[PDB]
Structures are given as C-alpha cells and as structure tokens.
Amino acid sequence: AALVIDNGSGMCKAGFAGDDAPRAVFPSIKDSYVGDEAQSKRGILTLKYPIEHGIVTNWDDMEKIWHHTFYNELRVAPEEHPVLLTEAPLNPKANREKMTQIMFETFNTPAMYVAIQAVLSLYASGRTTGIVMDSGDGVTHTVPIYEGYALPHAILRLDLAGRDLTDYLMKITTTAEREIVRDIKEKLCYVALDFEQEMATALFQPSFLGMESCGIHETTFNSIMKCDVDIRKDLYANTVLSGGTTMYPGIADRMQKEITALAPSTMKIKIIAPPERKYSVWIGGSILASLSTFQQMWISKQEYDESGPSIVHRKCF
Amino acid sequence: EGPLSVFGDRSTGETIRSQNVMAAASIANIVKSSLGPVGLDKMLVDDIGDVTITNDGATILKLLEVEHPAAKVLCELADLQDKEVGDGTTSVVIIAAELLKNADELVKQKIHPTSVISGYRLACKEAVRYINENLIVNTDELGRDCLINAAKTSMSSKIIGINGDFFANMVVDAVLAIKYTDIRGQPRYPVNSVNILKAHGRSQMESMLISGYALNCVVGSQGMPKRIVNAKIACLDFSLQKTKMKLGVQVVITDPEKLDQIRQRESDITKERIQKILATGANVILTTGGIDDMCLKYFVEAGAMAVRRVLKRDLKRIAKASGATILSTLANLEGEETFEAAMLGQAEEVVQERICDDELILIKNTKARTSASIILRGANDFMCDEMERSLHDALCVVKRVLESKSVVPGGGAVEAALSIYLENYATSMGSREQLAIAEFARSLLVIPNTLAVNAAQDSTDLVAKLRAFHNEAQVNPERKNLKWIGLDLSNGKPRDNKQAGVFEPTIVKVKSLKFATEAAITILRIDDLIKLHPES
Amino acid sequence: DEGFLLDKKIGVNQPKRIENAKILIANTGMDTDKIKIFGSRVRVDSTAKVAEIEHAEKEKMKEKVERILKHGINCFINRQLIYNYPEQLFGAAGVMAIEHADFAGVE
Ligand SMILES: Nc1ncnc2c1ncn2[C@@H]1O[C@H](COP(=O)(O)OP(=O)(O)O)[C@@H](O)[C@H]1O
Ligand SMILES: [Mg+2]
C-alpha cells in the first residue's frame, strides 16, 4: 500500500491508502505492562509541532515525529511502502529538498510524492478542476487547479486567516479574552451578504480590517483571470472552499455574489463548501495514492539517487 | 402528559417502584454468578473486539453501559466499595438489590416506605453492633497466618485462587515491605505504593516479588551500562536538554561576533548541570523530563545510567524508598546552583532486566526504606489484567486486616448469624418496623444462598443447616463456638471457618451493610419519575 | 428607600459600616492602569530591570491611591474594576472601596 502522511499544518493524520480515515493523528491523539510502550511516546507527547503557519521551522522535530508516526503509531516499515506527503502552496524549494532527503535517505522510502494540500482537498470533494480557497490558522491561499494540478503561476497569496479575522473582533487584549472573541469566531459568525442590512437589525473589504491589498473574492477572481480563458468556466463554476477559518463564518453566498459581479455575465459560478469531513486533505491523498497515476508520478528511490535535489525539483528550471 | 403538559414521561406508584426493583435486580443478576470460590469469570467485549476477562464486580459494573438510574446507583455503590475497602464489591451489590426486592415486597403489602426505611436503618445499626460485639476475631491471637488466610480468602474466586498458597505469601510480604510509621506511631500500609507490572510469558508461579522497585522504563542510550551495583540515585523533576530561553527573553544580535558564544551556552549550560550531578558520584539519574542525545552522551561517557520520561509517582516512590530528594531545579538558598551528595539516594543494585522481549529497570535493596514490586506473569494480557485486579483486591484486604486487627468468618457465617439475630430482634421494635427488620434479616441470606447456588448444590438444605447451627449458638450459651460455622462449598457442608481459615476484614462486611442499606433507602424513597425528552 | 441602594460588593479587608461618610465617586482605571502610550514596551537586558519596572508600576498605582486618599474620604466608588493591590491599599487606609458600579450607578 501507500502511506499517506497529511501534514496539512495540523497534525500528522497519517495512515494507508484505501482507509477512509487516517490511523495516526499524532499531535493530540498500555501502561502498567512491561516494555517501552509509553515512555517513548511520552517523549513525543510534549514535543512542539514543527509546522507553523504552514511552513516547517524545525526539521529534526518533524523527522522525529514522522519516525514516531511510522514505528509507533503505525508499527510499519517505510522501506517497502511509497509515501505521499503534503505541502502548503508556494512552499519553498529548500523545504522540499529537505523532506525528500529525509524520506529517501533516512526512512529509505522506495518512492514518494509531495502534493499540494489544496489539490488533495479538491480531490476529496471528488473533482479535478477548480479554484480552492484555503484559509486556515495562519495563511490564506487561492489555488487554481486544472487537470488536477495546481497551476504554479496563478497562485495568489493574501493573508487574512483566523488570526487576522478575529483581530478586528478583538478590537470591538488578554489571551483568555481575545480567546472569548475567538470562541465567538469558532461559533456562529454568519457571513453578511450586505453589512448594511446586517447591521441594520443591530476580508472582502481590506479597509474593514485595516489592510490595503485586496479582498479574497478579488483574489479568486484574479487567480481565475490568470488562467486559460477556456478553463475560466471551470474555475468560476467549481470554486471549492476549505479551511476552518472560512468555515466558521460559512461564507459562500457573499463571495458568490461579488465574484459573479466581477466576472463577465456569462460563466455561472457555483461554490461547493458543505463537506467539512475534517480529513479532506487526507482523503484526497488517499485517493491519489490509490490511483495508478500515483505510481506514474512516483519520484522513485533510484531517481532520487541519480538526481538529488534536482529530482525533487523536477528539473524545468 | 395531559394536565401537567410536561415534555416527558412520568411513572408513578407501584409502577416505578417495580421498575427500580427490576433494574437493581438486573444489575445483581449480572454479578451473582461471580461470588465465592465457585464463582466464575466474565468476558466483556467492547463493541470493537477489546476483550476483558474479570471476576471483579466493580470492574464488571464499570464496563457495562447502564441507562437506568436505579442501576447506575448500584454501579456507583460497587465503585464506592472498591474505593473505600477494596473487596466486597459484588456482595454489596447483591445485598442492596435483595434489600430493595424485599422492601418493595413490603411496600406492595402497603407498609409505608418510611416504615421499611426505619426498619432497615435500625437493622443495619444493630447488625453492625452485633458484628462488632460477637463475630470478630483479633489477628493478634492468630499471628501472621491470619494475614495469609485473609489473603487466600480474598484471592479465592479469582484466577490466582488455587495458587493462593503462594500468592498470599507475596501479598503479605508486599504489604509488610511498604509498611511505614507516621506521627502518633500508628503503622500505615499505603498500598498503591506496591508497584504491579504485567508481563505475559512464564507461568503465574514465576511471578516475582521485588524487594525494591520495578520501573516500566529503560536506559536512554544503548551505549550506557545496563547494570550498576553501588547505585547512587539522583531523582530529578526537570529535563536535561539544550537550554532554550523562556518566553520573555529574546536574543537579538547586533554584533555577529557574539552569536557563536550565545549558541554555545545553549548547550554548555545543560552540560554544567550534568557535570555537577556527576561530580557527586551519581551513577543513576532518573528524570521525569526528557534527556537530549547530547546529554545522554555525557551519561554514557561517565558510565552512568540515565532514564527519561519516568513517571512522577514512580519517581516519588523510588525517592522515598532509596533516600533521594526530588529536585525540580538545581538551586539552593544561596542564590547559586549546586547539587549536594546528601540529595542522593542509594540502592544495592540497579539493572535493566529482560522480561519476554521487553526490558524494565530493577532497583534492588534500597536503603532508608523497603519498597515492593510485583511482576505478574501469565499466558496473555487478559489473564495478566485479571491477575492485577485480583492482587489489588488481596492487597487491599491485607491492608484492612493490618489497620484494624479484627476479622470475621466467611462462608456466609456472618450473614447467617445476623439473619438469626435480627429475626429474633425484630420482635421488640414496633409492628411494621418489625416486618422491615425481619426482611432485612432474610435479605442478608442472599449471600450464602448465592454461594451455594454457584457451587451447584442444594442452597435450601445448606442454608437451613447454617441457620440451625447459628440458632443453636444463639440460644445455647455453651455452644457459642458455633458462630464460626459457615459454608464449605467444595463439599456442600457447614464447617468451622475460623479453623478452616476463611477470614474477611470486619470493615468489609460492615461497609457492605452500611452502603447497601443507604443505597436501598435511596432507591426505596422514589415513588415518581419524570424522564424529560432530550433538549435537542 | 429613604436613602439609596446599590447591588455591588465591598472589598475584602475593607470596612463594612461607615458613619458620616465622605464619598469619592470615580471613573478611573485602578485596574492594572497602563499609560495610554500603546507603543510603549519594556525592553531591557536583565530581569533585574524588569523587576524594577514592575515595582515602578506598583508604585504608580500606590501614588494614585494616595492622591485619592488626599481627598479625605471613607468611601470610594469606581465605575471600573478595582484590582487586588488598590483594594489592599484602600483596606489598609480604612476606606470602603465599592467597585464595578456602572455608568448608571455612578450617575
Ligand atoms: N474459601 C471460601 N470458603 C467459603 N466462603 C468463601 C470463601 N472465599 C470467599 N467466600 C465468601 O464469598 C463471598 C464473596 O467472595 P468474593 O466473590 O471473592 O468477593 P466479592 O464479594 O468482593 O467479589 C465472601 O462474603 C466470602 O464470605
Ligand atoms: Mg473478594
């Protein structure tokens, strides 16, 4: 089979291909028996999670985690199973070379592949083309995808995530009380089609927060407009949202309306954002690792030995 | 419904009383088959294939998924008996259920529940008094074999029954090892300080009593030694890792020439701490925190044994047992950082021992106190867990025998004597409370009845013989030696259980009666039930 | 009521009865009262200086309480909270410090 380790700036969410749920959610997942079956895990339990804002800070930590998400929470061997790792969109090449050196050299994995988290999210929803708006805890990303691959040239990156969202709400300071504001953020926070008619009975606009770059709907629109005019229909009509940040307000229709406004009066835009399987990236990875085109895309161990960081970078510089 | 309009169901009168009694009876019938030397164990499958074999009534009622409140009450009763005594968790449930049954029979006869409750309370008080005055044996008159007999009685009905002949010795030794005296010079036997480890493999007879301590831990590096003889032990409650500045401290370089030295301290700081420890002579270093590889190398080069992620309770016990001092910091009252050799503990040996493809640590012959560990050895994890539970029951029993030096006979002797005495005593108390006390007496007989039933013998004949013997004892002052008679379930015949060695701590029966009586009273006061529909 | 009633609390170590009461009604901070300069941050190279600055904060609060007491009062009512240190100071001074009255309460 193929181990599908979904880092997803969350937990490890590792398992096997074919499983509808991961089997190794390490971060925040016996005793009185004999052996080292708690101490070895007791060490990892208090180890800081390397990925911050969707980027790996401490690699030794991450490697120790993976090693403990292979030998302890899966009780398997990576020397015979291909691995599908996940990376955040627009992830530096250096991080890719590091993780590929870890897998092929340390864990001696026969073959591996690194997929974009938004692409796997789109896969778990069953589609292969569309523009994914991924807004988590630290970053916001718009990933246009056509034929199942994240077009590396139309990835617009703005920053208005859970933190930036709860910020203005705090404005309306202490950790516990800004987390009361964040509890309200976690709970119902219905998106407003029009803030006028929503405040009458009491990210889209940078000025609201205090930024001066662009809204998320503007971001999606321009990411669609930096693609093929023929696939434009598919991008506009298959916009898939993901991320607990964007889920909390449940923003579908405000986006839809202002994106329709921006787009020509031709393409009909439909946004599918009701899943919330809480393992979308994992299921997308499992689907990919189950396919045979994954064997096609395999960066093999021999390929790695022959090319190195160049094979991880897929040439084409 | 109807006039009330409450959004829920309502049971009222004989209906809800019958329901409560049915629930309690259900819970008691779950566990009735696990009572006495002839009781049998139960499997419990947790809807996922997780299996649990057990004879412990508290365990059984904990694993069950109960919805009725009158049954949750009996589950909590078994839990409370397990917390406060450690044995009697099945008998207490059976007795509470039988008291409920007979008391509901009385309430059907239209004896007011207040009167039944008064009679039950009176009968409980007088049964406690009669036990404390007539049915107790002092363990001083018997010596040490009394403890062994109490342990064997508690271990009978468990998977360490026939081997009790030997397990009791271990149990007794273990409690005697963990004996410690406090202020007022009263001896205290704090079980749960005996460590119990499980390791499938060799037979039960190969289970081990370690005079010292056993740790479910191993050395941190394979280059470290795995045996040390004159063990000087350092118990640390902090981690030995590369030093990280705390939250309110930042490193900001404006002269690159300083960066190197700063990085160097991040490790040299920890090095210095370890050197101080090793400077005192410490050959064994246990820590509740972690130990980086950098530090493990210092321990390796020193010829020391370092252990990380040890448990706080294991550490407290090793410290108390060896003479060491748990340090959360290397910091003294002089504003400096040092480690004194007086903070060390000692032990005649520390080893990394192999046990069925799994290693542990053995600290043997600690000074400043004796400690005790027990490695249970069976055929698989299910048996080992049942052995752990059985041994916990036995240890609690021996502890109770040693704290209060009174025991009572077993085999239904206490229940038979109380049945006789209370059926004679009810004649003086009122007219309806008389019926309540007689029913309390008759209810007490459910224990020998159940023992005989489980033995597959004539319960009626056996319990009648028992009551005859005990009546002879209570009406003929020359025959009080008959009080000690109870059931022999291997032959179906009464027997002098004080001479046979069937002893139970007085506190067991006393607390069983008190808790069962309160539970029955609590359930017997309900005459209505409003079950609301869920808010959703 | 011939007088007035307030559904608020008195401090811990502070009096419970006051005759011929002179009252200071206030809308001050008295709750970790920070200088309204928001870019202000304590940036030092020694925990000793952090402790000195903490002591200075406490001395600022103490001087505030002393300015209050210079009014010659026995009762102090604040619209905002009153934290543990000013509560202790008012208690040591023998002043009844009623806290968390509202805009309506103080009006
Ligand atoms: N060897 C024995 N002979 C006769 N009676 C026994 C013997 N061992 C235990 N009993 C009786 O069985 C009853 C229940 O024992 P057991 O089921 O082991 O404990 P529990 O009731 O706590 O589960 C006790 O009240 C005791 O009187
Ligand atoms: Mg028992």
Three-state secondary structure of B379-413? CCHHHHHHHHHHHHHHHHHHHHHHHCCEEEECCCH
Does A264 contact B at CB distance below 8 Å?
no
Rounded CA-CA distance B11/B407 in Å is 44
Rounded CA-CA distance C79/C106 in Å is 6
Q: Which subunits count as partners of chain C given 3+ CB pairs below 8 Å?
A: none
> Judging by beta carbons within 10 Å of its beta carbon (0-12, 13-18, 19+), is residue B178 exposed, middle or buried?
buried
Rounded CA-CA distance A83/B272 in Å is 42
Residue B202 has φ and ψ, to the nearest 5°, of -55, 160
Among A298, A311, A310, A314, smallest CA distance to A83 is for: A298
Closest chain A residue to the Cα of B198, Cα to Cα: A33
Helix (H) or strand (E) holding C35: none
Contacts of A1 (CB under 8 A, 6+ apart): A16, A17, A18, A81, A289
Cβ <8 Å between A43 and B359: no
Contacts of A38 in chain B (CB under 8 A): 216
Ligand 2 mean position, distance from CA B95 (Å): 14
Coil vs helix vs strand at B87? coil
Ligand 2 mean position, distance from CA B57 (Å): 9
What is the CATH architecture of B209-403?
3-Layer(bba) Sandwich (3.50)
Active site residue B357: no
Q: For residue B360, give the nearest of A34, A43, A46 by CB distance.
A: A34
Based on C-alpha coordinates, what's the Rg of chain A?
21
**Strand B284-287 relative to strand B231-236, pairing:** parallel
Give me the catalytic one of B104, B173, B314, B393.
Answer: B393
- Across the A/B interface, how many CB contacts are shorter than 8 Å? 44
Contacts of B375 in chain A (CB under 8 A): 34
CA distance A278 to chain B (A): 23
Atom of ligand 1 nearest to the CA of B410: 27
Distance from CA of residue A248 to its chain's centroid?
17
Contacts of B384 in chain A (CB under 8 A): 33
Chain discontinuities in chain A, listed by preceding residue (C to N exceeding 2.5 Å): 29, 172, 202
Ligand 1 mean position, distance from CA B489 (Å): 10
Cβ <8 Å between A34 and B358: yes
Count Cα neighbours of B164 within 13 Å in the Cβ-side half-sphere.
23
Q: Which subunits count as partners of chain B given 3+ CB pairs below 8 Å?
A: A
Ligand 1 mean position, distance from CA A153 (Å): 78
B204 φψ region: left (φ > 0), alpha (ψ -120 to 50), beta (else):
alpha
Cβ <8 Å between A34 and B217: no
Tokens 């790792």 belong to which residue? A85
Contacts of B150 (CB under 8 A, 6+ apart): B397, B398, B401, B407, B503, B504, B505
Cβ <8 Å between A42 and B358: no
Active site residue B288: no
Rounded CA-CA distance A179/A177 in Å is 5
Cβ <8 Å between B360 and A39: no
Q: Which residue is closest in CA terms to ligand 1's atom 25?
A: B410
Cβ <8 Å between B355 and A33: no
Active site residue B56: yes
**Strand B503-505 relative to strand B493-496, pairing:** unpaired
Q: In chain A, positions 40-79, which contact chain B (CB-CB < 8 Å)? A: 42-43, 46
CB B217 within 8 A of CB B360: yes
Q: Could you give the angle at which helices B14-31 and B69-84 cross, rounded to 10 degrees? A: 40
Rounded CA-CA distance C68/B373 in Å is 66
User: 10 Å Cβ neighbour count for B183?
Assistant: 5
Here the tokens at position A24 are 């190794």
Q: Which subunits count as partners of chain A given 3+ CB pairs below 8 Å?
A: B
CB A281 within 8 A of CB A124: yes
Contacts of A161 (CB under 8 A, 6+ apart): A135, A136, A137, A138, A139, A140, A243, A245
CB B384 within 8 A of CB B198: yes
Q: For residue B197, give the nearest of A32, A39, A43 by CB distance.
A: A32
Cβ <8 Å between A35 and B359: yes
CA distance B263 to chain A (A): 16
What lines the ligand 1 site, CB under 6 Å? B 35-37, 39, 57, 87-91, 153, 156-157, 410-411, 447, 451, 487, 489, 502, 504
Ligand 1 mean position, distance from CA C29 (Å): 69
Cβ <8 Å between B381 and A33: yes
Could you give the C-alpha distances from B375 to A33, B159, C103, in angstroms and in order? 9, 16, 69
Distance from CA of residue B150 to its chain's centroid?
15
**Structure obtained using:** cryo-EM
Contacts of B197 in chain A (CB under 8 A): 32-34
Among A78, A80, A62, smallest CA distance to A26 is for: A62
Rounded CA-CA distance B412/B485 in Å is 8
Dihedral sign (CA C97, C99, C104, C107): positive
Rounded CA-CA distance A39/B217 in Å is 7
Rounded CA-CA distance A44/A308 in Å is 30
Rounded CA-CA distance B31/B284 in Å is 48
End-to-end C-alpha distance for chain A, whole angstroms: 32
Active site residue B89: yes
Give me the catalytic one of B54, B59, B89, B366.
Answer: B89
Total residue length of chain C: 107
Among A170, A167, A248, smallest CA distance to A211 is for: A167
Q: For residue A34, give the nearest of B199, B290, B388 by CB distance.
A: B199
Q: Which residue is closest in CA terms to ligand 1's atom 9?
A: B36
Give me the catalytic one of B54, B59, B90, B287.
Answer: B90
3-state helix, strand, coil in chain B (%, to 5): 50, 15, 30
Rounded CA-CA distance A195/A184 in Å is 18
Distance from CA of residue B428 to its chain's centroid?
40
CB A1 within 8 A of CB A81: yes
Count Cα neighbours of B522 within 13 Å in the Cβ-side half-sphere.
17
Rounded CA-CA distance C96/A42 in Å is 52
Q: Which residues of B are annotated as a binding site for ADP?
A: 36, 88-91, 157-158, 411, 504
Neighbours of ion ligand 2 (CB under 5 A): B 87, 154
Rounded CA-CA distance A151/A137 in Å is 23
Here the tokens at position B185 are 């010079």
Does A175 contact B at CB distance below 8 Å?
no
